Write a protein that holds these residues in place. Sequence first.
Motif, PDB file in Angstrom:
ATOM      1  N   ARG A  32      -2.550  10.360 -40.020  1.00  0.00           N
ATOM      2  CA  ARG A  32      -1.369  10.255 -39.095  1.00  0.00           C
ATOM      3  C   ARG A  32      -0.175  10.278 -39.611  1.00  0.00           C
ATOM      4  O   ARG A  32      -0.027   9.611 -40.644  1.00  0.00           O
ATOM      5  CB  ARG A  32      -1.972   9.081 -37.915  1.00  0.00           C
ATOM      6  CG  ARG A  32      -2.164   7.994 -38.636  1.00  0.00           C
ATOM      7  CD  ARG A  32      -2.812   6.922 -37.802  1.00  0.00           C
ATOM      8  NE  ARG A  32      -2.380   5.538 -38.031  1.00  0.00           N
ATOM      9  CZ  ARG A  32      -2.508   4.689 -39.032  1.00  0.00           C
ATOM     10  NH1 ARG A  32      -2.683   5.144 -40.146  1.00  0.00           N
ATOM     11  NH2 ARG A  32      -1.891   3.339 -38.738  1.00  0.00           N
ATOM     12  N   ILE A  33       0.873  10.483 -38.867  1.00  0.00           N
ATOM     13  CA  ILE A  33       2.339   9.915 -39.199  1.00  0.00           C
ATOM     14  C   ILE A  33       2.900   9.707 -37.870  1.00  0.00           C
ATOM     15  O   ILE A  33       2.537  10.054 -36.728  1.00  0.00           O
ATOM     16  CB  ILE A  33       2.973  11.317 -39.520  1.00  0.00           C
ATOM     17  CG1 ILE A  33       2.396  12.100 -40.925  1.00  0.00           C
ATOM     18  CG2 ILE A  33       4.579  11.040 -39.880  1.00  0.00           C
ATOM     19  CD1 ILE A  33       2.834  13.366 -41.365  1.00  0.00           C
ATOM     20  N   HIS A  46       8.257   8.360 -29.352  1.00  0.00           N
ATOM     21  CA  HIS A  46       7.149   8.107 -30.238  1.00  0.00           C
ATOM     22  C   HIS A  46       6.734   9.501 -30.873  1.00  0.00           C
ATOM     23  O   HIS A  46       6.315  10.067 -29.724  1.00  0.00           O
ATOM     24  CB  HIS A  46       5.926   7.197 -29.607  1.00  0.00           C
ATOM     25  CG  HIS A  46       4.760   7.272 -30.730  1.00  0.00           C
ATOM     26  ND1 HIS A  46       4.787   6.184 -31.572  1.00  0.00           N
ATOM     27  CD2 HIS A  46       3.596   7.783 -30.303  1.00  0.00           C
ATOM     28  CE1 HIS A  46       3.617   6.208 -32.160  1.00  0.00           C
ATOM     29  NE2 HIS A  46       2.819   7.242 -31.537  1.00  0.00           N
ATOM     30  N   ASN A  48       4.060  11.319 -32.890  1.00  0.00           N
ATOM     31  CA  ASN A  48       2.808  11.357 -33.642  1.00  0.00           C
ATOM     32  C   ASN A  48       1.896  12.379 -33.980  1.00  0.00           C
ATOM     33  O   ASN A  48       0.951  12.610 -33.347  1.00  0.00           O
ATOM     34  CB  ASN A  48       2.138  10.056 -32.933  1.00  0.00           C
ATOM     35  CG  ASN A  48       0.883   9.544 -33.436  1.00  0.00           C
ATOM     36  OD1 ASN A  48       0.035   8.999 -32.769  1.00  0.00           O
ATOM     37  ND2 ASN A  48       0.712   9.590 -34.797  1.00  0.00           N
ATOM     38  N   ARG A  50      -1.374  13.777 -35.305  1.00  0.00           N
ATOM     39  CA  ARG A  50      -2.584  13.308 -35.553  1.00  0.00           C
ATOM     40  C   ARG A  50      -3.350  14.349 -36.346  1.00  0.00           C
ATOM     41  O   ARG A  50      -3.599  15.260 -35.794  1.00  0.00           O
ATOM     42  CB  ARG A  50      -3.585  13.022 -34.231  1.00  0.00           C
ATOM     43  CG  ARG A  50      -2.627  11.740 -33.616  1.00  0.00           C
ATOM     44  CD  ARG A  50      -3.139  11.318 -32.003  1.00  0.00           C
ATOM     45  NE  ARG A  50      -2.479  10.164 -31.567  1.00  0.00           N
ATOM     46  CZ  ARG A  50      -2.665   9.486 -30.570  1.00  0.00           C
ATOM     47  NH1 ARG A  50      -3.955  10.221 -29.872  1.00  0.00           N
ATOM     48  NH2 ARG A  50      -1.896   8.523 -29.975  1.00  0.00           N
ATOM     49  N   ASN A  62       5.289  10.178 -26.773  1.00  0.00           N
ATOM     50  CA  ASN A  62       4.982   9.353 -25.706  1.00  0.00           C
ATOM     51  C   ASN A  62       6.258   7.965 -25.889  1.00  0.00           C
ATOM     52  O   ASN A  62       7.072   8.090 -26.646  1.00  0.00           O
ATOM     53  CB  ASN A  62       3.844   8.584 -25.631  1.00  0.00           C
ATOM     54  CG  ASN A  62       3.301   8.123 -24.358  1.00  0.00           C
ATOM     55  OD1 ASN A  62       4.219   7.935 -23.383  1.00  0.00           O
ATOM     56  ND2 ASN A  62       2.057   7.483 -24.249  1.00  0.00           N
ATOM     57  N   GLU A  72       1.518  10.616 -21.927  1.00  0.00           N
ATOM     58  CA  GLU A  72       1.662  11.507 -23.258  1.00  0.00           C
ATOM     59  C   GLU A  72       1.988  12.861 -22.985  1.00  0.00           C
ATOM     60  O   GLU A  72       1.581  13.688 -22.004  1.00  0.00           O
ATOM     61  CB  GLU A  72       0.368  11.645 -24.048  1.00  0.00           C
ATOM     62  CG  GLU A  72       0.025  10.092 -24.739  1.00  0.00           C
ATOM     63  CD  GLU A  72      -1.309  10.257 -25.456  1.00  0.00           C
ATOM     64  OE1 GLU A  72      -2.138  11.192 -25.229  1.00  0.00           O
ATOM     65  OE2 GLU A  72      -1.862   9.177 -26.004  1.00  0.00           O
ATOM     66  N   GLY A 126       3.003   5.822 -41.446  1.00  0.00           N
ATOM     67  CA  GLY A 126       1.851   6.730 -41.820  1.00  0.00           C
ATOM     68  C   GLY A 126       1.663   7.364 -43.215  1.00  0.00           C
ATOM     69  O   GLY A 126       2.199   6.780 -44.224  1.00  0.00           O
TER      70      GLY A 126
HETATM   71  C1  LIG Z   1      -6.680   5.049 -26.718  1.00  0.00           C
HETATM   72  C2  LIG Z   1      -5.638   5.289 -27.258  1.00  0.00           C
HETATM   73  N1  LIG Z   1      -5.563   6.211 -28.465  1.00  0.00           N
HETATM   74  N2  LIG Z   1      -4.194   6.311 -28.923  1.00  0.00           N
HETATM   75  C3  LIG Z   1      -3.483   5.717 -28.274  1.00  0.00           C
HETATM   76  C4  LIG Z   1      -1.955   4.965 -28.526  1.00  0.00           C
HETATM   77  O1  LIG Z   1      -1.440   6.299 -28.211  1.00  0.00           O
HETATM   78  C5  LIG Z   1       0.065   6.185 -28.352  1.00  0.00           C
HETATM   79  C6  LIG Z   1       0.653   7.553 -27.733  1.00  0.00           C
HETATM   80  O2  LIG Z   1       0.331   7.446 -26.392  1.00  0.00           O
HETATM   81  C7  LIG Z   1       0.451   5.853 -29.784  1.00  0.00           C
HETATM   82  O3  LIG Z   1       0.157   7.104 -30.740  1.00  0.00           O
HETATM   83  C8  LIG Z   1      -0.149   4.522 -30.040  1.00  0.00           C
HETATM   84  N3  LIG Z   1       0.305   4.055 -31.585  1.00  0.00           N
HETATM   85  C9  LIG Z   1      -0.286   4.850 -32.542  1.00  0.00           C
HETATM   86  C10 LIG Z   1       0.160   4.111 -33.617  1.00  0.00           C
HETATM   87  C11 LIG Z   1       0.538   4.447 -35.194  1.00  0.00           C
HETATM   88  C12 LIG Z   1       0.546   5.793 -35.406  1.00  0.00           C
HETATM   89  C13 LIG Z   1       0.509   5.672 -37.232  1.00  0.00           C
HETATM   90  F1  LIG Z   1       0.895   6.950 -37.447  1.00  0.00           F
HETATM   91  C14 LIG Z   1       1.035   4.640 -37.862  1.00  0.00           C
HETATM   92 CL1  LIG Z   1       1.171   4.806 -39.317  1.00  0.00          CL
HETATM   93  C15 LIG Z   1       0.703   3.283 -37.280  1.00  0.00           C
HETATM   94  F2  LIG Z   1       1.213   2.265 -38.254  1.00  0.00           F
HETATM   95  C16 LIG Z   1       0.515   3.207 -36.021  1.00  0.00           C
HETATM   96  N4  LIG Z   1       0.945   2.951 -33.069  1.00  0.00           N
HETATM   97  N5  LIG Z   1       0.913   3.183 -31.717  1.00  0.00           N
HETATM   98  C17 LIG Z   1      -1.767   4.842 -30.143  1.00  0.00           C
HETATM   99  O4  LIG Z   1      -2.412   3.700 -30.484  1.00  0.00           O
HETATM  100  N6  LIG Z   1      -4.122   4.504 -27.440  1.00  0.00           N
HETATM  101  C18 LIG Z   1      -3.992   3.471 -26.848  1.00  0.00           C
HETATM  102  C19 LIG Z   1      -3.990   2.260 -27.630  1.00  0.00           C
HETATM  103  C20 LIG Z   1      -3.951   0.941 -27.024  1.00  0.00           C
HETATM  104 CL2  LIG Z   1      -4.092  -0.398 -27.794  1.00  0.00          CL
HETATM  105  C21 LIG Z   1      -3.322   0.934 -25.606  1.00  0.00           C
HETATM  106  C22 LIG Z   1      -3.103   2.123 -25.108  1.00  0.00           C
HETATM  107  C23 LIG Z   1      -3.224   3.132 -25.499  1.00  0.00           C
HETATM  108  C24 LIG Z   1      -2.837   4.456 -24.823  1.00  0.00           C
HETATM  109  F3  LIG Z   1      -4.105   5.536 -24.556  1.00  0.00           F
HETATM  110  F4  LIG Z   1      -2.679   4.480 -23.504  1.00  0.00           F
HETATM  111  F5  LIG Z   1      -2.041   5.306 -25.023  1.00  0.00           F
END
Ligand SMILES: Cc1nnc([C@@H]2O[C@H](CO)[C@H](O)[C@H](n3cc(-c4cc(F)c(Cl)c(F)c4)nn3)[C@H]2O)n1-c1cc(Cl)ccc1C(F)(F)F
Length: 138
Positions: A32-33, A46, A48, A50, A62, A72, A126
């Motif tokens: 990821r980035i 944000h 990202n 994947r 997002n 998202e 990332g």
């Molecule tokens: C489940 C789930 N699956 N993905 C996510 C989150 O989805 C978000 C987009 O909607 C961001 O991508 C979040 N995220 C990713 C990163 C990151 C990326 C990098 F590439 C790096 Cl290197 C880095 F350090 C950090 N930090 N935060 C990611 O954790 N969640 C998730 C997780 C939690 Cl704790 C709460 C809510 C969600 C939800 F679904 F609602 F979005």
Amino acid sequence: PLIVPYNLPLPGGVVPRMLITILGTVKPNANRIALDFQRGNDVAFHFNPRFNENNRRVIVCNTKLDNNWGREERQSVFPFESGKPFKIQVLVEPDHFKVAVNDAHLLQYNHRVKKLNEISKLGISGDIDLTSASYTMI
Ligand SMILES: Cc1nnc([C@@H]2O[C@H](CO)[C@H](O)[C@H](n3cc(-c4cc(F)c(Cl)c(F)c4)nn3)[C@H]2O)n1-c1cc(Cl)ccc1C(F)(F)F
Ligand SMILES: [Cl-]
């Protein structure tokens, strides 16, 4: 060669016609980035990529407000490749952030955070080797 996570200050925030350019190389086994345009603790935008979300490559975008992620926006067009040099350009427009990767349009993300002049930091993290991060007015 810059250290990741990297913080690029955006003094006085962003404004339409501001072009942010990030140059780096994707690591050979990247997962990821993430680019995080921040307004204090909120994440206005944000961006990202994947590399393996259920064995598919997807761009997830997002906003995070009061520590809660919103709805998202997904893009299946995925221009990154592990091991390759890239250039991400984020053009701030009046109603959107427009993103192009390696000089090809990728997506647009409508402004949910409206105080553009308070989005004063870009976090870069990332699986990349970061070469440069800067901005200019077009
Ligand atoms: C489940 C789930 N699956 N993905 C996510 C989150 O989805 C978000 C987009 O909607 C961001 O991508 C979040 N995220 C990713 C990163 C990151 C990326 C990098 F590439 C790096 Cl290197 C880095 F350090 C950090 N930090 N935060 C990611 O954790 N969640 C998730 C997780 C939690 Cl704790 C709460 C809510 C969600 C939800 F679904 F609602 F979005
Ligand atoms: Cl992620």
